[PDB]
Each structure stands twice: as structure tokens, then as C-alpha cells.
Symmetry: D2
Subunit: 268 residues, 4 copies
């Protein structure tokens, strides 16, 4: 017609997690064969971005707060939106092994459903905002699964002192996630303590807004990462802890990744 136009496929999966012992939800956007560049048709090695949500969000957050499905509609990229509830992408002290579920089970589930997604590091990426920025860097440092990793307004440094002081949720919550604050192993949850064992083959990007409550956290964390020689680029701009800025950062991410992003025309 001229009236007709493509769309990515939108897939919502509910599956049984053996790790968590419960039904879990994951959303997947999958490229539109009729709209990607000609060369990409039939691909058996499609690149994949895992995009992680913030505290209070879920598998719908990115899709509803950005117009990601519109942005990517001409691009050869699978995007996976997992859920972690309020568990920080962490195996918690109350027995929910969210990190194991994210890092070990989810990729196996997806591969089993979707053999044509890439299994290559050079085509596997992660990013997230807020709690999801912590999750993205944690997963990339520990797993060496990703070529590129990004944090937007991430909680990239913390301590008991900062978590609680009880402006950021109460003690029982934080100790449920990370263990008791007197446990000498608490520090294993600190991203700075995970750099040494990572392989140094992941590119990192971090952003934070000047006005964000986590701006000081990011300044401190990046300084510590840079001291250890992490391959990181850090940027800042005016902004707060809000989804408009996360949308902007998604659009920066899409150009940074090696995905041949087909940016929509904008005449106004």
C-alpha cells in the first residue's frame, strides 16, 4: 500500500526456572526479516543485547518506557529483557539464586528456544539502568560472556554506610539481598572486587547525570575502576534518575555496539 510497514516480532515467554523453582517471565524482541538490510536475511548468528531493568521494574520496563521496538525495527538485533524482581541480579541471602538464573539458566533456555541467536562473545552485549547497571557490570565482569557492557545511572559503588543510613530502603531489605552487613564476605558483592579476576576483554561504558543521587557513587566507582586499568569510558550530562535519560542512553548504546544500527530518519 505505502500504508503498510514492518514491525519486529515481540515475544513474551513464561518458562519454568529450575534454578529459582518458579515460573519466570522474559521478553524478547526479534528482528523483522522484511525490514533488516538484505545481507542479514537468514542469519544463524544474530547478535543479542541483554537489557536489564531497575529497582521496581520488570521484563516490560524497557519496552514501555522507551520506544525500543520502533527504534530497532530496521536493525538485525535480538534484545532480551529478563526480570530479577528486587533481587539485584544476585544470589540472595533468602535463597533466591537470581544471579545463577540470569547467568547460567537463562542463556541455556534462550538457546534451546532460539538456536539462531549468536553464541559468540563478539556479538553478545549487556546494558542496564540503576540496579541494572550494577547487574550489567557484575555479569560482564564475572562471566566474560560479553564484548560490550553498559551502565546507565548504575549503583556501581556501595556500602552499608550508604545503603542504610535508611534513606535508600531498610536494613532488612538490604541484608536480604547482600547478606548481613557484618559478614566478612559482604565485599564480594562490590564490583571493584571483581575486576582482578575478569579477563580484561570487555569494553565498558558508564553514564550518570550530574543531578542524580548516584552521581557521587559513579564518580567514586569509575575512579576505582580506572585505577585497576579497566577498559571503561565514562560520560556525564545533566540529568536525574529518570527514564527519559535512559532512553537517550539507549540511543547512544545502539551506535556504540557493533550492530550496524539502522537509525530512523528524523526530518524534524
Amino acid at each position: 500500500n505505502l500504508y503498510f510497514q514492518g514491525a519486529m516480532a515481540s515475544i513474551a515467554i513464561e518458562y519454568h526456572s529450575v534454578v529459582l523453582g518458579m515460573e519466570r517471565k522474559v521478553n524478547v524482541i526479534y528482528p523483522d526479516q522484511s525490514e533488516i538490510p538484505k545481507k542479514d536475511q537468514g542469519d544463524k548468528d544474530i547478535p543479542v543485547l541483554y537489557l536489564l531493568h531497575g529497582m521496581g521494574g520488570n521484563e516490560n520496563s524497557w519496552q514501555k518506557r522507551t520506544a525500543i521496538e520502533r527504534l530497532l525495527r530496521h536493525t538485525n538485533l535480538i534484545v532480551v529483557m529478563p526480570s530479577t524482581d528486587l533481587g539485584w541480579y544476585t544470589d540472595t541471602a533468602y535463597g533466591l539464586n537470581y544471579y545463577r538464573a540470569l547467568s547460567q539458566e537463562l542463556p541455556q533456555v534462550l538457546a534451546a528456544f532460539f538456536p539462531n541467536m549468536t553464541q559468540k562473545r563478539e556479538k553478545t552485549f549487556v546494558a542496564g539502568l540503576s540496579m541494572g547497571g550494577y547487574g550489567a557490570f557484575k555479569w560482564a565482569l564475572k562471566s566474560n560472556r560479553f564484548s560490550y557492557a553498559a551502565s546507565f545511572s548504575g549503583a556501581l559503588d556501595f556500602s552499608p554506610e550508604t545503603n542504610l543510613e535508611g534513606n535508600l530502603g531498610e536494613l532488612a531489605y538490604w541484608q536480604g539481598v547482600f547478606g548481613q552487613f557484618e559478614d566478612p564476605d559482604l565485599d564480594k558483592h562490590y564490583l571493584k572486587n571483581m575486576v582482578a579476576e575478569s579477563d580484561g576483554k570487555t569494553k565498558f561504558y558508564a553514564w550518570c547525570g550530574y543531578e542524580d543521587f548516584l552521581f557521587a557513587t559513579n564518580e567514586k566507582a569509575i575512579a576505582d575502576f580506572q585505577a585497576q586499568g579497566l577498559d571503561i569510558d565514562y560520560h556525564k550530562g545533566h540529568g536525574k534518575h529518570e527514564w527519559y535519560y535512559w532512553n537517550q542512553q539507549l540511543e547512544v548504546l545502539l551506535e556504540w555496539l557493533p550492530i550496524n544500527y539502522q537509525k530512523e530518519e528524523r526530518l524534524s
Copy 2:
């Protein structure tokens, strides 16, 4: 926490349409009691915008192609996203009474589920893009239900000559929607022929991009509407038949409507 933030409620309804004789889907976004201005808490007369999709879309289109759920999250507005398949919001010649289903049944269904939505014209609005711009103006002209109506890149004028010539879909399709092209009643589907009987108490807005295939259609249609004294404001800018521009127009619409839109802060 400072980490926590609200969200609108997102409601997906599947219901039995007696008019269409089938299960139908409608999405509704409903304002977050914890985030709207104080005065709006407990409202029993909440304003409502019906937002109509384009050819090939459905009840998910606006939500996935704009970040409407983010934009409206501090605003006291219900938004309803109906579906019409490829039926043009029209009672078709193949027996699917989509116009009756939209104009008569859907509002009764919604009121029955949601008694706290407004029943007032001064708080009831419609808009749509492409086919949905035709639908929005048709519904507003015929029903007098709305105070404000908006069309974005709408198919606001047409004839056999323009539909088909077969660049815009084939004959059987168009005649299925509007009837045989030799029927002397074809012209009842033309928006210009619906102005006389409307009550003149609806404000109209139309937009079209210069580069759009429907730019000439809109120029012609608005000239005809203005000749009949319709209360319409018409604007144009650079743009094509694409969702980025429809997102921009949604943001213009939200300020135009009498809804006390709480626009998100944008520091960059």
C-alpha cells in the same frame, strides 16, 4: 529509597463483542494514584483519550512505538487503545460492524468496567494516526461525543481514483471496507460529507508531514473542511508516514488537550 518511582497501571482486556461476534482486545492505561497531582486523588470523573491505530496495527501500537506510559505517568488521564484490524473503523461490506463496535459498544463496556472514567464531553478526546486519523475525525463528526479530536497524517480525503489505481492495496480490499465503488452511497464514507450533520462543538486538529504520500490528501481535505466552517487547526512540518513523527504529535496533543499534562523534566 529514592530508587523507587511510580508507574501508570497498564490494563489489557479481552472481552466478548456482541456487535462483532468475537473476542476483542482493548488496552487501557490508568493514572497512578501515587504520582498524579494531589487534587486528582479519588477522582470519579477522570478524563479519557481514545487513541486509534493505523493500518496494520492494533491495541499495542501506541504503547510500543511511543513511550506514552512514561510520558503520562504524572498526569490524570485514562488512555484507551482499541483495535479495528484492517476495517477502517467502519461497518464494512463483509459484515463486520467495526464502527458500531467502536462507537456504541466499546464505551459501554468500558463504563461498565470502569465507572470512575468521565462521561462528560468536556473531558473526552480522540486522536489517531493514518487510518486512525480518518477514524478519529469520523467518530468525532458523527457522535458529538468528544470535545477535541486529532488526526496525524490521516487519510482524510479519498476516492476510487486514488485508493486504486493499485498503489495503495487492491480493489477487493477497498471494496470490502467501503462497498462497491459504483454504489451511489460510497460517498457517505467521505469525511467532507459528514460535517453538515455534526454539531460544530468539537475542536479539530490535523497534522501532516510535507514529504508524506498523504500530504496532498490533507491539503485537499482541510481546504474542504475550512470551506464548510469546521473548527480546525492544521499544521505541517517536515516528515513522512512514520512513527517518530506520530510520537512528536502525541506530545503536541497532550499540551493541547485540557488535561493538565505534567510534562517530564528534560535537562538534556
Copy 3:
């Protein structure tokens, strides 16, 4: 725990149909690796049942009206639930090519998403109820894609005389689906006229309740099929045009198909 138990994966897909020129929905239930018999783990040739809905239904009908997701949870079977609106799995006279979309596009879409589903006739099955029984037999007769095909209370014979006489919907509806009733090609829609060209390598099953308004239709249709030597088994019982009986027939179907159905224990 003993408290934990598996579930099939439930997948909801929205995809762009090039054939129909619109976003379409298809549901897929996919076997639980942790619950199927040991031997089936890792299968790259998983059997597939397409299950078609009735007039007024959609891709959710089977899942919500039967407890299919519970019944199949130990069985190595993919089940696909397509949607055809009110189009009878037919390329209609108003330009919606539902048959092409079902028979050609949908299998290619699914294979592209899900390479581990079978591509073998011996592991590919179809069934449906009411309109979906017509669709199941039509698709199996025309395509030779299936080893087994089943109709439950199907509209397996019809004419203008029976459609309309206007007890079963009005003329414009029926002629929109099948063309004008005076067209000499109307009879190409009759299943009896499709037997000659089918390959005779599909097993057919049909059921109808004695009290159903289509009981006479089924008696006539099966007699005509049996006259042509179709490989069909036909059964009847007390019942009407209702989902309880369709649930019962699903359970009969699951034993008939060569799928090694792992029937749940029922101690009461």
C-alpha cells in the same frame, strides 16, 4: 521441595504478517525439558500439533477453555494456536488471505524462530473445532503437510441454502468469506471437492455430538468422504456445540496421535 513442579513454556508471539499486511498473534506451548521423558531431552525434531479455534475465538481459546498446558506438561509436543479472526482459514473475497497466511507464512515464521520443531510430516498434526474443524481438514487436504488431522464438531459440509437462510449469520458476512453465492467457483470451498487432489496419506478423525446443530452436516460430509475413499474414522456421542466436549475430544486426540502422551494420573 516436593512443593516444586514443572510447567511447559508458554510463548506469546506478535509478528508482522507480510501476507495479511498486519501484526498477527500466535501462541505456542513448548515442552519443559525437566519434565518430559529422559530420551526426549535435546530433541531437534520435536513434534508439532496446530490447534485451530472456532468462530469468535482466537489464539487464547484452547488455552483458556481446556487445561491443555496442564494436560501436556509431561509430553514432548509443541502446540501452536494460530488466529484467523472470522475468516474461516480462507483467502476471503475482501482481500484478507488467511489461508495463505496459515499455510505458507506461519510455518516459515515458526521455523525461523524455532529450528528445533520438526519439519517431518510423520510428526506434524492439525486439529480444530467448529470453523476450525473445517480449517483443519481443508489445510490437511490441500497441503499434504500432516500425518493426522482432526475435526471436532466441524462445519464440514455447507451450501448457500444452509449458511443463509439467515439463522447462521447474514448474507454479506458469508459472501465476504466465500465469495458471491452465484459465482461458479463457490464450490471450490467445499471440502468434498478437495479430496481428489489430496495425496491419501493423511489419517482423518471426526467427532460430532448428536444434539449439535451440525450433526446432520457431519453425517452428510462423512458419507461423502467415505464414498471417495478418504481414510477417516468418525465418531459420535451425546453433546452439543460446547467447549466441554471439545476438551474431551482433545484428550482423545492426544492418545490417537503418535506423540507418546504422558497422561496425568487420576486417582479420583
Copy 4:
């Protein structure tokens, strides 16, 4: 047509929980105005059943494992399916206040969306299976909101000794839900300790299968309830910890409740 038939409306709601500080999902089935008995049309006091899931389930469990949407389609009943993750409908020791969210917030959310649901005890009911049987009895004992409450294979008695011994999940899990096992307040989670303060105006029903791992638990719990004079009827049959039996018990529940259940005809 005779081909057309009604359906209940199926509503999926995602809403912001202030209590939990996260987006939460609740499903609602709402009666079909065209199919309920004549007298019920226009009701502003529609009865409501809350139906709670088991460990590992969610808001979709009842709908997918029973054909509840089919069973209730002629009946004037709203059914609400909440989610509690693995939190036992309890304000947990890791800071997720699931009980407050269920008992205080959810009813206010639903009333705000759906003013025509009843606010009367005589028309408000709860039931659940496994963990959800514990939840149903807990909520009914504490709140006095319900006239009728039902448990199917519920975990109605427990201790450290039985939880763990580590056949039923590990220590960290159970202590995350209920607190440390040495806390003298552990016993506040025991349903037997909640009877004294309840008002004695709720009717209780419990079922358990003989072969279920919780059969001894139910025998013990009911004996303790009967010693305290609770108004309870307890039944047992052959069965295990499986959804087929929960489906059977749902069908018993529907006749027990004062809802004028319109049971589907079953001629076979």
C-alpha cells in the same frame, strides 16, 4: 449464528505497588453481561472470589491449569488471581511485605479500578491450593473480610522440624520467609495461633488427598482447628499434590459458595 457464544472478560493488570515498591501483576475474570442470568445484568455488588496460587506459580496458574474461564462463563462472579512469588502471602524477613500488599493494598486497588465489585463480606470469598491454602486461611483468620474460605492440599501446619529437615527447600529460604527459627515470634506464623483472635464468622473448607505428602499435616492441622471450635468442614479423597485434583476442588468450591453457579451441561 448459533455459532457464536459468549465469554467472560479476561483482564490482566500491571500496577505500581507502593507497599512492595515494584510493578505487580494481578489477573481478573469478569462476568459476561450477555451470558449471566437476566436478573444479574447491571449488578453493582458483584461477588468476588480471590484464588491464590501455590509455590512456583503466579497470577496465570489457575487460568492455565483449570478451564476456570469456561466453567464460570454463565455465572455472576468476579475472580481475582494475585501473585506472591515465593513469599507465602507473608511479610517476609527480607523486607517484602506480601501480606500487607495482599490484604490492604490489593483490595483498594481493585475497588478503585472496579467500583461495581462487592464490598460485602457475604459476597467475598477466598481459596487456594498448597501455599495458597495457607494464605487463604491466614488471610481469612486475620482479616475477617470473607464469608467463605477454602484450602486445597494446604500447608496448614508446620515447624522447623518439618520444613527443614531439608527435603522441603533449604534453611535460608524458609528463614527468609518466616524469620530465624530461633525467634520466639516464629509461632505467630502458625495458623493454629490465629484462631483465637478471628471473629468466628467465616466458614472454612479444607481438602487433602490421602497420598499427598501433606496429608499428615492436614490431619494434624484440622484436629487442632476443631479443638478450638473453628467452623470447618474437612474432606479427603485419593489424590496427590497435583493440579487435576485442584481443578476438582475448584468445582466443589463453586457449588459451596453462595454464587448461584451455572454449571455447564455435560451429556457425556
